[PDB]
């Protein structure tokens, strides 16, 4: 177990660690999704305007743009998803959806004190998108209930 | 390197034929049939995997040093001599004829 | 055993000029080590051939003319690996042996030679798991 | 052990039965976590309970746990023929080895009965070629296991050379034993009738083999 | 009226094998802008002075150098840089 | 899926040294502690120590802190979440009453108040510390015997005699036949020797056709025996059907 | 589908040489490895050597080391093989052969039509 | 370098075979400095093996797949074109030379 | 009225339906804004690196990039707007702004049980951006009031 300042530097640092221990490092994985791995000892000037010639159409030029856009392309998908689950701006979000033993019948400690996330995500590999569908179906049945409430509410 | 057993064995269109092949060291084992005029056509290559246009009749099997090749519903169009390949090493060969 | 010059020789460029050095000397064999009283051992020199009009990657890409560098040139590289290929057929089981020869056909092997220790993965930040925490007005009695 | 659990407890099939564990303030119980193992003698144990309240994976809710300030307990309900083994408790901390209990053997009352399947064999030619010949008798598939032996050569109580084994439980959940008789081929030829009789809940069945009768 | 619910975590430390576009980063030590390189072009982003290599404790990962898109990526980059570099240069066909 | 396999049985002079093995498989080795427990002669079970394959952190009971020596090998990765590993225990200056069944057991959890807790136990490894020498199993075959002759059933087997120390591992038909087999225990005779019997319950029909062979072995005396059971019975007990 | 059309089988005499071509189609001639497997009366199908048409890289079978010479015109996509010091025993029908895929040469799904040389 | 949300994994095993598990891994965003050397038979100016010299192949038995050797200690090779060749510019218009 | 799982598939499925009924389908319209229309029976591998040649500069290559970036370009505008209205991560967000009869004087049911959204948005077509301006002006008068509060609050 390391310090709060090291946690920031340790991208994928709780990969082989137990699922419960991984939660201190949620932010550091998130930050990587757009900015890549964090830099400590050196922090150069990352501002705009570094293309002073026709170099934006070269091999690397195109490649970089593709990598830049893909990076945000993907980030938004993850956000939009969390959004339509009603978990916007939450690194840990409780839902209305009850867990299913068919998905997994492990106790808290059988998971959180015994499994790594990739290990567990491999167990839930099959039932994942279906859950993603319930998460979203829940959110709707919530929005429905609100309009329901706005009707009785004069 | 490959002792393709048996030596030679021809039989009727009804009886289901079986050809085996011994193995020295590990490696993908395939089979080919040399029909009249034609080239040795690939029939079974990885072991249990069939080639392009090969019917269910042909079926490969077995684990370890030996490896089998089985076909029922034989025909005059299924005549010719077979071969057992491993890497660049071939086997003796076994045939079905008149 | 054969092929384009670049494949049947050691090819590279020093300061821009492209070389084709006869690796025959490097592969005579000399396997049994006696050392001969540490004699007959200085440098081993390979005849090199030099060419200017040059086409890499075969068909993809055009032919290039390498302009000559004026004056004599010499570069030193460090040999960090080799690309070999085995002659394979049935031979004397006891006590026979296999022979190896150099190959340089596909440049991808040069790239595999350095990249072997790397792989790229995609990160999957979303994760889902059971918990005794419900939504709305409850997080288990509070 | 210092941590003393009960000697032996009796339970009734279908219902429950409890096992207690206790010792001085050191080995128990406050600020000490308690576990439970079923430990079928001759086989590797099985963890039933580990955090007193908590059950191991795949364990039935039948088995339940409770620890008071001075004692640990272990309820085991819907009793079965497999629960006739001996169980163990243990007191441990988050960073210290287990302090196993004294052990508790369990009896599951009100279960069916079975009769000892005897199979008497003669001393083979190899034995008779020594010359040292021994008889081989073996009872199996019987319970309750509380049985007793009585060999009879010409209806006489035999003493020297007669070795019996203590009855062991089986995969058939029943108890089984075995007894021998070491003599010479000269004695074997002959002393009337060499009988192998054994008793169980009154039923004293006999399976005999002799060289003349 | 339940016991356990789906709980959603963002920033979860998981990865899967993947093929993607890779851009280039150069050591930027090439002072001379005049004498510019065919592979380390101006489009290569400047290197990090400190290359941060994070040890993945408790992680065992399978590799296979013989099925690695990186080399095909690297290979096609190489031959594309070589082509782009003589694209502006003078044709010698009168010879 | 996990699996801990211990070493074979050993017979040691009192005052001698010995090292017990524990080869793991099916799970990540360094993820869990390996424990050591022994079943004493008259002291029941007895946790000796545990050790972390990952950190090397040991915890030895005061009793053995200067008697046994817990050590481990480095894990060999098989899959992303499985690895082979080996754990050891050298209990030197072997006193008496050390004769018993020695167990290794992997931990329960990876983080919590019960991480090291023995969950997956091994096979055991019976130790016999003694002056007494070693003696092999005098294997003889048992003739066929029909118990319920009205139906036609019967039983055959092999008798193991005059050996020490325990144990003896029997098998049938080169280690293939499993149905009807039944290995009984044994007792300490006056001399000191042990003696068991293994029965495989099969009728008197497939006698002259099917083969039955007892594959007996004894690791302490290092013997491996194969015996053919003779299909013959000159007695009034079985001779009814024919 | 791919196909490997071949030359006509010439008539030869011992102590001489022969050259038999093989034109490929339907695939990138360079990307995949081509072999030469001849078939004589009764003997196991004899592989002589593979040819990687990238840089003419080759690998000949031991008994044929010295006589065999596999080349290619990467422009006409033609595969060439010369065989000097002829014998009545090395007489056979010749088949240029490429594998199932470029990841493995030894599953010869694609054979060329036989070329019959007579000695 | 990989895009954001992606990462490169570097095998730090000192006696690595190429395929299979790696006990010692480390994530990086960028590959270390790799010089694009184009050479044949001999691999020049590259990375030596940490443990000892290494042989790698998809399967050695398949003779049709290249053996890739990695030395532990490098071997200097010094090549040269020793002649003092003077060069001339030959122009053909407009200024093309 | 269809099922919760069908709701997910029915993009623009409550287009001709009444405004009150459209609320169960809010998430499904949102998800389309970045990922387009959802796919059910088939879900292929949409990962990166499918451009293995100089095809990124062709007709379709450029077109795709334009469509990819425009898609997120627009998504953010809608988000940033909701954000400066104080409705971040809300599919239904209450405001402080009172409704104006001049905008519309229909009762709840006169709207929600009688109109489709496009129908209604056509009625409010004129007064929309002005509302968008009030929504934003409200948010500011809120932020002002907070700083006001931070001043008295020592
Ligand atoms: C592997 O690896 C290895 C290693 O790494 C490698 O090798 C390498 O290589 C490299 C490359 O090639 C190299 O480098 C090079 O070199 C060279 C030489 O040097 C020298 O000299 C110089 C000068 O020069 C001059 O002289 C010479 C002789 O000497 C000649 O040859 C030349 O040509 C020139 O001439 C001139 O003059 C004259 C008079 O004299 C006249 O006549 C004429 O006309 C002209 O004018 C010098 O400078 C140098 O010096 C250096 O060194 C020293 C020591 O030795 C020091 O003292 C000094 O300072 C210097 O150093 C520095 O740096 C370093 C680093 O580097 C450091 O360490 C130090 O400290 C310092 O800082 C000598 O002495 C040269 O020349 C070159 O340069 C060039 O190149 C580059 C690139 O590479 C660049 O950058 C520059 O700028 C230049 O450029 C040029 O060229 C190019 C091509 O080449 C081009 O592209 C450009 O654009 C330009 O061009 C121009 O010019 C030319 C001429 O030059 C012409 O042709 C054109 O047309 C235009 O006009 C470089 O530097 C090295 O050396 C090597 N090394 C070894 C060890 O070997 C290899 O390669 C590899 N391999 C593989 C396979 O990869
Ligand atoms: C197999 O193949 C292999 C590869 O294919 C073969 O490898 C080759 O092996 C050869 C030897 O076997 C190697 O040859 C060695 O070369 C060096 C070169 O140093 C000289 O050049 C330096 C830079 O160039 C200047 O000089 C050249 C030549 O004159 C000019 O052309 C340049 O223009 C440039 O000119 C400047 O300098 C001059 C003055 O020299 C000025 O007038 C100009 O205006 C310019 O300013 C240069 O730095 C060196 O200068 C030092 O040495 C001078 C004397 O030579 C001295 O006057 C200088 O003051 C200076 O000394 C001071 O500065 C240095 C700076 O580092 C300090 O370290 C030093 O202490 C002083 O403070 C030099 O001009 C050459 O030096 C070597 O000579 C040594 O080895 C030979 C071997 O026969 C010995 O016999 C010599 O005694 C000598 O030993 C020295 O070291 C001893 C200690 O170890 C010491 O005790 C001695 O007293 C002595 O100082 C070699 O000749 C060749 O490089 C190599 N090639 C490659 C690619 O590897 C291999 O041979 C082959 N084998 C077989 C079996 O086939
Ligand atoms: C590229 O090049 C590479 C090489 O560089 C190629 O790689 C290999 O490719 C092959 C396939 O092409 C892979 O598959 C292996 O196939 C083996 C074939 O086994 C058969 O033949 C043997 C012949 O001896 C036979 O024993 C086997 O049957 C036995 O088991 C059954 C079930 O019990 C029984 O019914 C039989 O009668 C046999 O058992 C009797 O006989 C035994 C004789 O020794 C007795 O010991 C036994 O008690 C009984 O009396 C079978 O018919 C197969 O064996 C291989 O299994 C390996 O590897 C597996 C992983 O792939 C692993 O899961 C297995 O457990 C086994 O591992 C063994 O060795 C390691 C060594 O450390 C141990 O750690 C293991 O625990 C295990 O050993 C124990 O178990 C043994 C059996 O009980 C026992 O003898 C031993 O003492 C230990 O107790 C494979 O499945 C092969 O994996 C590839 N790699 C290698 C390295 O070989 C590759 O193909 C090529 N590429 C291409 C495209 O071709
Ligand atoms: C391929 O071909 C290549 C070309 O031929 C070939 O390249 C050459 O290889 C050699 C190696 O064989 C290169 O290195 C040389 O090594 C000699 C031995 O090095 C030992 O000494 C080092 C320094 O020791 C300091 O500390 C000691 C502590 O007591 C002192 O006693 C020393 O006096 C010295 O003092 C320090 O402190 C002083 C304080 O007052 C200070 O002044 C002084 O400058 C210095 O800082 C040790 O570090 C080293 O040991 C290390 O490694 C071992 C394990 O290997 C560890 O156990 C140790 O703990 C330690 O980490 C060695 O014991 C050097 O003598 C030789 O000196 C040159 O460099 C020094 C500066 O370092 C110069 O001052 C000096 O003039 C020498 O010339 C250099 O400069 C000139 C002018 O610029 C230049 O022309 C010349 O080429 C050279 O660079 C040198 O370091 C050699 O440099 C390579 N040459 C080239 C051109 O590349 C290659 O090997 C071939 N490879 C193959 C595979 O074939
Ligand atoms: C990679 O994989 C590996 C393997 O899976 C992972 O390692 C695992 O990490 C977890 C969590 O760190 C471990 O669980 C913990 O185990 C310890 C065991 O205690 C041992 O160490 C004690 C000291 O620990 C410090 O020192 C060691 C170096 O030795 C450091 O490595 C540690 O980090 C600590 O800084 C030591 O005191 C103990 O020894 C005893 O006996 C010896 C011999 O007689 C004496 O010398 C000692 O004095 C002592 O008497 C012992 O050897 C537990 O202590 C932990 O329990 C605490 O935390 C639990 C929750 O996590 C909680 O349930 C416990 O009750 C306890 O709670 C703490 O807080 C309470 C708050 O009220 C306190 O009241 C309480 O007293 C206590 O302070 C925990 O169970 C795994 O064992 C470990 N796995 C292995 C195989 O070792 C690793 O995490 C993975 N990831 C990475 C990135 O590496
Ligand atoms: C820590 O997590 C691992 C999983 O990575 C747990 O291991 C798993 O345990 C179960 C039994 O508890 C093993 O078998 C199961 O069997 C039942 C039938 O009896 C079957 O229905 C299940 O699907 C499952 O197969 C399972 O194989 C095993 N997994 C592995 C990879 O070994 C482990 O138990 C957890 N630790 C604790 C203390 O709970
Ligand atoms: C999750 O559920 C499976 C069954 O779906 C559990 O399997 C147990 O297997 C043992 C084997 O002896 C049975 O006795 C139990 O009755 C089974 N339990 C159930 C609930 O059926 C498995 O143990 C459970 N836990 C894990 C971690 O997989
Ligand atoms: C190897 O070839 C080199 C060529 O430079 C020569 O000097 C050497 O004598 C040769 N050795 C043998 C054993 O042929």
mmCIF file of N, CA and C in Angstrom, chain I residues 94-124:
data_model
loop_
_atom_site.group_PDB
_atom_site.id
_atom_site.type_symbol
_atom_site.label_atom_id
_atom_site.label_comp_id
_atom_site.label_asym_id
_atom_site.label_seq_id
_atom_site.Cartn_x
_atom_site.Cartn_y
_atom_site.Cartn_z
ATOM 1 N N UNK I 94 -35.647 20.073 -13.890
ATOM 2 C CA UNK I 94 -36.461 21.201 -13.452
ATOM 3 C C UNK I 94 -35.627 22.467 -13.353
ATOM 4 N N UNK I 95 -36.241 23.606 -13.649
ATOM 5 C CA UNK I 95 -35.520 24.866 -13.578
ATOM 6 C C UNK I 95 -36.197 25.850 -12.642
ATOM 7 N N UNK I 96 -35.638 27.050 -12.585
ATOM 8 C CA UNK I 96 -36.188 28.107 -11.759
ATOM 9 C C UNK I 96 -37.049 29.028 -12.599
ATOM 10 N N UNK I 97 -36.916 28.885 -13.912
ATOM 11 C CA UNK I 97 -37.621 29.736 -14.854
ATOM 12 C C UNK I 97 -39.095 29.375 -14.971
ATOM 13 N N UNK I 98 -39.975 30.338 -14.665
ATOM 14 C CA UNK I 98 -41.421 30.153 -14.771
ATOM 15 C C UNK I 98 -41.872 30.148 -16.223
ATOM 16 N N UNK I 99 -42.893 29.358 -16.537
ATOM 17 C CA UNK I 99 -43.395 29.311 -17.898
ATOM 18 C C UNK I 99 -44.204 30.571 -18.209
ATOM 19 N N UNK I 100 -44.247 30.931 -19.487
ATOM 20 C CA UNK I 100 -44.905 32.147 -19.956
ATOM 21 C C UNK I 100 -46.045 31.778 -20.902
ATOM 22 N N UNK I 101 -47.245 32.286 -20.628
ATOM 23 C CA UNK I 101 -48.409 31.971 -21.449
ATOM 24 C C UNK I 101 -48.190 32.392 -22.894
ATOM 25 N N UNK I 102 -47.438 33.472 -23.073
ATOM 26 C CA UNK I 102 -47.099 33.969 -24.400
ATOM 27 C C UNK I 102 -46.365 32.899 -25.192
ATOM 28 N N UNK I 103 -45.516 32.144 -24.504
ATOM 29 C CA UNK I 103 -44.851 31.002 -25.115
ATOM 30 C C UNK I 103 -45.899 29.963 -25.490
ATOM 31 N N UNK I 104 -46.726 29.605 -24.511
ATOM 32 C CA UNK I 104 -47.850 28.697 -24.721
ATOM 33 C C UNK I 104 -48.759 28.690 -23.499
ATOM 34 N N UNK I 105 -50.060 28.626 -23.742
ATOM 35 C CA UNK I 105 -51.025 28.649 -22.657
ATOM 36 C C UNK I 105 -51.843 27.371 -22.604
ATOM 37 N N UNK I 106 -51.216 26.265 -22.978
ATOM 38 C CA UNK I 106 -51.879 24.978 -22.924
ATOM 39 C C UNK I 106 -51.699 24.370 -21.542
ATOM 40 N N UNK I 107 -52.715 23.658 -21.065
ATOM 41 C CA UNK I 107 -52.609 22.941 -19.798
ATOM 42 C C UNK I 107 -51.638 21.771 -19.934
ATOM 43 N N UNK I 108 -51.420 21.045 -18.841
ATOM 44 C CA UNK I 108 -50.565 19.864 -18.879
ATOM 45 C C UNK I 108 -51.056 18.903 -19.954
ATOM 46 N N UNK I 109 -52.301 18.466 -19.807
ATOM 47 C CA UNK I 109 -52.869 17.455 -20.686
ATOM 48 C C UNK I 109 -53.051 17.985 -22.109
ATOM 49 N N UNK I 110 -53.257 19.295 -22.238
ATOM 50 C CA UNK I 110 -53.365 19.932 -23.549
ATOM 51 C C UNK I 110 -52.064 19.821 -24.328
ATOM 52 N N UNK I 111 -50.978 19.552 -23.607
ATOM 53 C CA UNK I 111 -49.670 19.351 -24.205
ATOM 54 C C UNK I 111 -49.313 17.879 -24.195
ATOM 55 N N UNK I 112 -49.153 17.359 -22.984
ATOM 56 C CA UNK I 112 -48.543 16.058 -22.755
ATOM 57 C C UNK I 112 -49.409 14.896 -23.217
ATOM 58 N N UNK I 113 -50.709 15.132 -23.336
ATOM 59 C CA UNK I 113 -51.632 14.072 -23.717
ATOM 60 C C UNK I 113 -52.254 14.353 -25.081
ATOM 61 N N UNK I 114 -51.714 15.351 -25.769
ATOM 62 C CA UNK I 114 -52.343 15.856 -26.978
ATOM 63 C C UNK I 114 -51.351 16.202 -28.080
ATOM 64 N N UNK I 115 -50.111 16.493 -27.700
ATOM 65 C CA UNK I 115 -49.108 16.909 -28.671
ATOM 66 C C UNK I 115 -47.952 15.931 -28.793
ATOM 67 N N UNK I 116 -47.337 15.909 -29.970
ATOM 68 C CA UNK I 116 -46.055 15.247 -30.141
ATOM 69 C C UNK I 116 -44.983 16.312 -29.964
ATOM 70 N N UNK I 117 -43.762 15.895 -29.659
ATOM 71 C CA UNK I 117 -42.711 16.851 -29.343
ATOM 72 C C UNK I 117 -42.405 17.775 -30.511
ATOM 73 N N UNK I 118 -42.261 17.205 -31.700
ATOM 74 C CA UNK I 118 -41.957 17.999 -32.885
ATOM 75 C C UNK I 118 -43.109 18.967 -33.170
ATOM 76 N N UNK I 119 -44.327 18.505 -32.911
ATOM 77 C CA UNK I 119 -45.523 19.328 -33.022
ATOM 78 C C UNK I 119 -45.434 20.515 -32.078
ATOM 79 N N UNK I 120 -45.096 20.226 -30.830
ATOM 80 C CA UNK I 120 -44.979 21.250 -29.802
ATOM 81 C C UNK I 120 -43.780 22.160 -30.010
ATOM 82 N N UNK I 121 -42.645 21.577 -30.368
ATOM 83 C CA UNK I 121 -41.446 22.363 -30.623
ATOM 84 C C UNK I 121 -41.650 23.328 -31.778
ATOM 85 N N UNK I 122 -42.617 23.018 -32.633
ATOM 86 C CA UNK I 122 -42.965 23.887 -33.747
ATOM 87 C C UNK I 122 -43.812 25.058 -33.259
ATOM 88 N N UNK I 123 -44.562 24.834 -32.185
ATOM 89 C CA UNK I 123 -45.347 25.899 -31.575
ATOM 90 C C UNK I 123 -44.427 26.853 -30.820
ATOM 91 N N UNK I 124 -43.437 26.279 -30.150
ATOM 92 C CA UNK I 124 -42.491 27.038 -29.341
ATOM 93 C C UNK I 124 -41.289 27.457 -30.188
#
